């Protein structure tokens, strides 16, 4: 009862994935070895989030903890944890391709990119910024494919021109994620068109893609593939186990845009530390992990009421009262929790 897929394999750099589908990276601790390993086993691109890896297995692999938080960027972005996450994912998926997702705004971005390459990533995905120096840190890892997340055709042109002038290389792909002209059905064609100036770089559409109908819409607009996160957030294999319990009663009213210490908006569930901020009992802010450069070691966290490293870390640890919980706008459509296998079958059959 599942017709062979008519979707065709997607080549990114030297890497081929069976289905033109990325499971979007999700931190902290949402897309680690069980999720990304099982996604890649099923033939989509599993993506490991490289942010906050110091939290992995309750801070098993860090060198220093202060106040139950990984101490500084070197422990918050823990190379030893990252190595173990990748190794555990490949116990599930073998040599099927795996990405690492690294936000450009993090402190020590270049170290974490090199760490991801050494951990065995085949692909690096980077948004939250304009990542003009991505290949600077990968010179030892030429065959690792490099993919910026962009929200405009202008960004593609600036990136191709700056990479080409400095590295004589251009990106292997672009993920287009909107932040009426920022509607994905308008944005993707504009980016695909602009890409032709540089040699038809595959374009991956992301944001609000729920089912095969959405996938086919994006493909027919010139996208080479899609990236989906919220659907995989509703799988059993999600490494942050709170979401399987929280999502099936989530109502659309409980999803809101919030400011963040990174200087970009996030979409959050009105629960955990978000609820603590309205009640006035939220935790004190005291920058320990120094997670992102735009925060200025607590300046913006104090302004928006929460520390995103602490809050996302607490969610991975199962903390319902003070954790920070993210969702795409479609999160209210998660009515059951299903397996990654069953999800991939629903997205690819026919
Ligand atoms: C819980 C959660 C965590 C996320 N974390 C990251 C992240 O660490 N890095 C990143 O580039 N995008 C992150 N995103 C965005 C997703 O990777 C993805 O591009 C977007 O949510 C796709 O839209 P969809 O959820 O409608 O499919 C996150 C999204 C969610 C819901
Ligand atoms: C369709 O898209 C959505 O609805 C959606 C919903 C939620 C988040 C995102 N994007 S995001 O990259 O996660 C992000 C955006 C703004 C501020 N912060 C982060 N992330 C982050 C920062 C620091 C650390 Cl330490 C860890 C992480 Cl995960 C997108
Ligand atoms: S205070 Fe700011 S920089 Fe420090 S860990 Fe929290 S969000 Fe990151
Ligand atoms: Mg529902």
Residue numbers in the entry: -1 to 177, 193 to 363
Sentences reproduced from the published study:
Subsequently, we examined the enzymatic activities of these compounds and found that 8p (annotated as FBX‐1991, hereinafter) exhibited an outstanding inhibitory activity against FabX with an IC 50 value of 0.158 ± 0.030 × 10−6 m in vitro, and increased the stability of FabX by ≈18.2 °C (ΔTm) at a concentration of 50 × 10−6 m. In contrast, it does not inhibit the enzymatic activities of the structurally conserved homolog FabK, the functionally conserved homolog FabI and the conventional UFA synthase FabA at compound concentrations of up to 10 × 10−6 m compound concentration, indicating a high selectivity of FBX‐1991 against FabX. To elucidate the inhibition mechanism of FBX‐1991 against FabX, we determined the X‐ray crystal structure of FabX in complex with FBX‐1991 in space group P21 at a resolution of 2.00 Å resolution. Subsequent structural analysis indicated that FBX‐1991 binds in the region between the FMN cofactor and the catalytic tunnel of FabX surrounded by α10, α14‐α16, β3‐β6, β9, and β10, and inserts its 2,4‐dichlorophenyl group into the catalytic tunnel, pointing towards the bottom of the tunnel near the [4Fe‐4S] cluster. In the structure of FabX–FBX‐1991 complex, FBX‐1991 is stabilized in the catalytic tunnel predominantly through hydrophobic interactions. The methyl benzoate of FBX‐1991 (A moiety) interacts with the isoalloxazine ring of FMN via π–π interactions. Meanwhile, the carboxyl group of the methyl benzoate group forms an H‐bond with the sidechain of Arg280 located at the N‐terminus of FabX β10 strand, which further stabilizes the methyl benzoate in the correct position.
We later discovered that H. pylori encodes an atypical species‐specific bifunctional dehydrogenase/isomerase enzyme FabX, which introduces a cis‐double bond to the saturated acyl substrate of ACP via a backtracking mechanism that expectedly reverses the conventional fatty acid elongation direction. FabX utilizes a nitronate monooxygenase (NMO) flavoprotein family conserved flavin mononucleotide (FMN) cofactor and an active residue His182 inside the catalytic tunnel to extract electrons/protons from the acyl substrate for dehydrogenation and cis‐double bond formation, storing the captured electrons in FMN and [4Fe‐4S] cluster cofactors, respectively. Subsequently, FabX transfers the stored electrons back to the oxygen molecule located in the oxyanion hole between FMN and His182, generating superoxide (ROS), which is further excreted by H. pylori as a major source of peroxide, likely enabling its pathogenic function of gastric mucosa corrosion. Here, it is demonstrated that FabX is essential for H. pylori growth and gastric colonization by retaining UFA synthesis and producing ROS, respectively, and is a species‐specific anti‐H. pylori drug target.
